[model samples]
Target: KKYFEIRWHGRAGQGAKSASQMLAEAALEAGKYVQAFPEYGARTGAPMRAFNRIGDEAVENPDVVVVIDETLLSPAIVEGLSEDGILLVNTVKDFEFVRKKTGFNGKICVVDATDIALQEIKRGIPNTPMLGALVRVTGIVPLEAIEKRIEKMFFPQEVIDANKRALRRGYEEVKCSE
Candidate 1:
């Protein structure tokens, strides 16, 4: 089966699953077939994984691997990544550190999503901004589409607007390896 797979690494309450849905939904909004589901790891607040499949079939050998939490960075995250895969991560650290830590020589994208969230969204959650980083790195969906989803999915005009700001900043601030 062929598909564009995105495997996400985060903690249970980190909202990786919701971000997966948000990414898939935006892809769907752009007229692509998509699927999102979490692969629970026997608990909460612990390591978690969610999957996004876009295109024609079930996901396998992910083409884009996203790490929502920097603590989740490990060699295993790139285990099944495609040779031309893109690794998107949330961190306030440096890019070379991420490159060496993950051992991923492919394209690397880094965004201080958590920091952006704290400043803009008044929270430490990086999920929403991760979606923006992915969009910036992959162009899998339009930035505008994601902003619409944010407005549609969550509550309170202020919070929604803040997240939208976070998204834009995430997209703007993302640094991709050459």
Candidate 2:
């Protein structure tokens, strides 16, 4: 199929909205129809959500809140995701523990992007690393294109290089298994 949807779960400061929007922009840059939106709320670190749907054709309900965090572990969100959908995570916890927490078993991908971000970017913010893992798992956007998108978003020479390193480190660290 030429269409796909991603449901991301993560906290407010972790770049949930930025990552979702960048992913959507990357997809759109590649000529795919896409939508990316966050679930508006009054609470800030209380777990926000975002959605992205891409296809050769247009998507119908692109405004749905299909994720409560970047981990894609929400009960209501997982049910709506297609069996072939890709779930990108930012947790440092074990995969099984996460699986049990979310009960989502199809095509799940993991990334300890939190650690990667801290190590490479000297902070806990991991949206860049998580984006790297996203690229690795789905090839939704070319890695170079994602890198360029990242550079466009983050300016200043030092900040840009730091995030680029974080992205590469995160992408390489992802362990893909069946």
Candidate 3:
């Protein structure tokens, strides 16, 4: 595919907007046309959605769909995903567990993004860790590109270091199955 798209799902305050912007910025740095947008102003249970598109040309239906909260799993989320698209979830469960739960048979990936976030960033939000997994799985942008964005987003050296480690751990720990 010449184009790539991703839809992110999370609850309010989970950093879905940041994740979308981070990936879009990285793709732009890599010389690709990109779009990143977020729908906000909702509560905890409300859907926090963000979208990203990257390519030589304009993008279309998503090629990668990301869910940061396990509670958001549903057939509707994967309804329009491409056949070869990737479905990444922020969960500690195995690939089989996610596949069966979502009834999605395409390329499925699972990562313990929350665990990594808490361990590294001292929070339960999984957006950054999930971004790392997204880059690792899709290669939409170089990992270094994402890290650079992170450095720019976080001021304190300690926070930057911790999030960097979280991203690395997320990249290394993501499990994917075709």
Candidate 4:
């Protein structure tokens, strides 16, 4: 395909919008046309959705899909993904478990993004780590690009350092299974 799209599933406070926009920016920087938008629900705990498309041309089917929180699981998570596309999830389980649970035979990448966030950011928000996993699994953008964006978004060196660590950990540790 000439383009790629991504649908992100998470709750309102989980950074779905931020991650999606960040990805769009990174892809644009990489010289791809990009678009990002969000569908938000009621409160912080309510379901949230973010979408991104990056490619030489506008695309429909998603080339990659991400679920930042398992609490939002559904068959629709895998609905728009291409046959060879990747599905990334923030969970403790391995990709084998994810494949079994979702019945998605495509490439699956699993990361304990929440754990990475807790260990590195001193919180449980998984967006940054999930972004790391996304970059690592899909190679949609370089890690340095994402790091630079994070650095600009976060002013404090301490916080930036922690998040950079979390991102790198997610990149290094994400497991992929058939």
True-structure RMSD, every candidate: 1.9, 3.5, 2.0, 1.9
Per-residue accuracy of model 4 over 64-131 as CA lDDT, tens digit each: 77999876666766776777888899988777677766778889888999999999999999998999
Q: What would the per-residue lDDT of candidate 1 be over residues 72-91, giving only the tens digit for each residue?
A: 89998778887688988888
- For 109-157, candidate 2 gives per-residue lDDT tens digits of 6777878888888988878888888777777678887778877876588
Error of 3 at 79 (Å): 1.2
Please report the TM-score between candidate 2 and the true structure: 0.82
Q: What does the lDDT read for residue 39 in candidate 2?
A: 72
Q: lDDT winner between 2 and 3, please give it.
A: 3
Instruction: Score candidate 3 by lDDT.
Output: 0.85
Q: In model 1, where do residues sit more than 4 Å from their true spots?
A: 56-59
Off by over 4 Å in 2: 57-74
Cα lDDT of model 3 by residue, 75-157, tens digit = 77787787789999998778787777778889999999999988998998898889889989988788999899888886679
Candidate 3: Cα lDDT at 4: 71
Poorly placed runs, candidate 3 (over 4 Å): 57-60
Clashing pairs in 1: none
Per-model TM-score, in order, reads: 0.92, 0.82, 0.92, 0.91
lDDT to native, each model: 0.86, 0.69, 0.85, 0.84
lDDT of residue 88 for candidate 2 = 56
